[PDB]
């Protein structure tokens, strides 16, 4: 014996990088050299999840300024970070009195978002982040629709919110 040797739908994570590299180089040759897109790799699995978690703090990777299917997965959580920043920018204030209380109540949700970030995962898998922040990311989108960042303020906003 000397072992039949796997094929190109059984091996992965070494052959995935090789095939991604092959698919990429084929594409650039078939285009002409104008489809240039460096790195058929980057990052890892757990390290990539840690980077994705850090994007919610306010940092970006390299494809935004404020494996290649990672862009599609990454846009879904990157757009969450970019509206979380526009929420914290609007909860910076402590017109109207009821509007101040409303801001302090918004911070009771942002505190949950800040408690869960960098604490809850021991680094889950990549697809689990997209699934876990689907039922939770939609609510963040709802609070993005709620806030203005005209947009009402004061008792007019309290009555609208009623």
């Amino acid at each position: 014996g000397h072992r039949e040797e796997p094929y190109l739908t059984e091996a992965g994570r070494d052959a995935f990088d090789k095939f991604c590299r092959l698919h990429q180089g084929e594409l650039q040759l078939l285009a002409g050299g104008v489809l240039q897109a460096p790195q058929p790799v980057l990052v890892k699995e757990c390290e990539l999840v840690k980077d994705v978690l850090n994007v919610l703090i306010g940092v970006v990777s390299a494809t935004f300024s404020l494996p290649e299917s990672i862009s599609s997965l990454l846009s879904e959580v990157a757009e969450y970070g970019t509206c979380y920043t526009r929420l914290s920018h609007f909860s910076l204030q402590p017109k109207g009195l009821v509007f101040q209380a409303f801001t302090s109540g918004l911070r009771r949700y942002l505190q949950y978002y800040r408690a869960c970030v960098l604490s809850t995962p021991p680094t889950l898998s990549l697809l689990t982040i997209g699934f876990l922040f689907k039922k939770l990311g939609r609510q963040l989108r709802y609070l993005a629709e709620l806030c203005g960042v005209a947009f009402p303020t004061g008792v007019k906003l309290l009555s609208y919110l009623y």
């Binding site: 302090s104 408690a115 960098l118």
Partner: protein, 129 residues
């Protein structure tokens, strides 16, 4: 995250300087009682820092924990430092820094994190009055 945690140190230096510069009999008994109730919250801040030290030595404190931990007293120090600036700027003594606390207590009252503070500071400052 480090940038957001530094402002409490300036807002702690301002609170410790009020007890020295405004402790003279020209500002009077009310200012002495006012700075002596400013002193109690600084005592409470140091009481926070001791238990946080015990968690940090064993590596069981992180910057995400410290951020959530120092956010409540950030507001506390913000109010006390702003009040120190206002009492210094108008050279207030007598009843003018017993009306200012009454005004601050209404100013933020929707959450009443600052209202209990200003109510306590007025309770302590109005006894010599």
């Amino acid at each position: 995250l480090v940038h957001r945690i530094l402002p409490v140190a300036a807002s702690y230096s301002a609170v410790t300087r009020f007890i020295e510069e405004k402790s003279s009999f020209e500002y009077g008994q009310v200012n002495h009682a006012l700075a002596a109730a400013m002193r109690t919250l600084v005592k409470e801040h140091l009481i926070l820092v001791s238990q946080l030290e015990q968690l940090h030595r064993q590596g069981l404190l992180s910057l995400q924990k410290l951020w959530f931990y120092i956010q409540p007293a950030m507001r506390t120090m913000d109010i006390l430092a702003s009040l120190a600036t206002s009492v210094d700027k108008g050279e207030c003594l007598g009843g003018s820094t017993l009306s200012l606390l009454h005004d601050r207590s209404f100013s933020y009252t929707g959450d009443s994190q600052a209202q209990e503070l200003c109510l306590y500071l007025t309770k302590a400052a109005s006894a010599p009055y």
